[PDB]
TrEMBL record:
Binding site for Mg(2+) 3: E65
Binding site for Mg(2+) 1: Q11
Chain residues that bind Mn(2+) 1: H45, D93, E104, I105
Protein name per the record: Polymerase acidic protein
Residues noted as binding Mn(2+) 4 in the record, renumbered to the chain: D93, E104
Binding residues annotated for Mg(2+) 4, in chain numbering: E65, D93, E104
Residues of the full protein shown: 1 to 195 of 409
Binding of Mg(2+) 2, residues: H45, D93, E104, I105
């Protein structure tokens, strides 16, 4: 129960992000006390989605990730019925009103190439945009369209590498990398 990874995640991430990740994991029947690597990954993905939405304009991004399943699906339904974009098979992460498209954010511990391959093979909706970040500073977006400016993506990559460094300083990075 008393794992180093859980305490590190509680010390490293914002309390609201921790609570959101806990709720998202408990909604799918997962315990952050035992599945600590998945807990860290969920916190990281949440923080990345939030930083991504922070970029761009004020009314640019509609945030899907973070809400519970029912409200998230309701928001996607409203977006689809308002704009006319095709309904995605799986719950995306954000919606860009400027580009008028759903965005799926990915955070991987390996090369962005194979991760984007799997993410584009698991979903068949070719309209949804995909954006993958790595823990080493690499990024990969659909049609070479990175949506945001270079500064926001650079901040995201810097935060990711800081998280990796803090994990390695506690001898927890190897297990986290092998978990994925
Ligand atoms: C309050 C929350 C609304 C948002 C959550 C999101 C928080 C996010 C924004 C960061 C970047 N910024 C931008 C402003 C300053 C700041 O720090 N981060 C991450 C790190 C700490 C933090 O604040 N915020 C808060 C301000 C606007 C916004 O986008 N959303 C969208 C749906 C899911 C979710 O949580 N809501 C809404 C009701 C339930 C709930 O929790
Ligand atoms: C095809 O994705 C899905 C997605 C859902 C909706 C809820 N989940 C997510 O949102 C989500 N989930 C993962 C990891 C994951 C977890 C469970 C199943 C698949 C995956 C993934 F994405 F690796 F395929 N990472 C993300 O980055 C992310 O956002 C429901 C079903 N499938
Ligand atoms: Mg800290
Ligand atoms: Mn998601
Ligand atoms: Mn995602």
């Amino acid at each position: 129960r008393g794992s180093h990874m859980e305490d590190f995640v509680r010390q490293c991430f914002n309390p609201m992000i921790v609570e959101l990740a806990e709720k998202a994991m408990k909604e799918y029947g997962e315990d952050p006390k035992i599945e600590t690597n998945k807990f860290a990954a969920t916190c990281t993905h949440l923080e990345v989605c939030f930083m991504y939405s922070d970029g761009g304009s004020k009314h640019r991004f509609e945030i899907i990730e973070g809400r519970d399943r029912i409200m998230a699906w309701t928001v996607v339904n409203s977006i689809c019925n308002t704009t006319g974009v095709e309904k995605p098979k799986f719950l995306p992460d954000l919606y860009d009103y400027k580009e008028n498209r759903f965005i799926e954010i990915g955070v991987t511990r390996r090369e962005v190439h194979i991760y984007y391959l799997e993410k584009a093979n698991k979903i068949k909706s070719e309209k949804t945009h995909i954006h993958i970040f790595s823990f080493t500073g690499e990024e990969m977006a659909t049609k070479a369209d990175y949506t945001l400016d270079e500064e926001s993506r650079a901040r995201i990559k810097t935060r990711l590498f800081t998280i990796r460094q803090e994990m390695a300083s506690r001898s927890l990075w190897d297990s986290f990398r092998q978990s994925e």
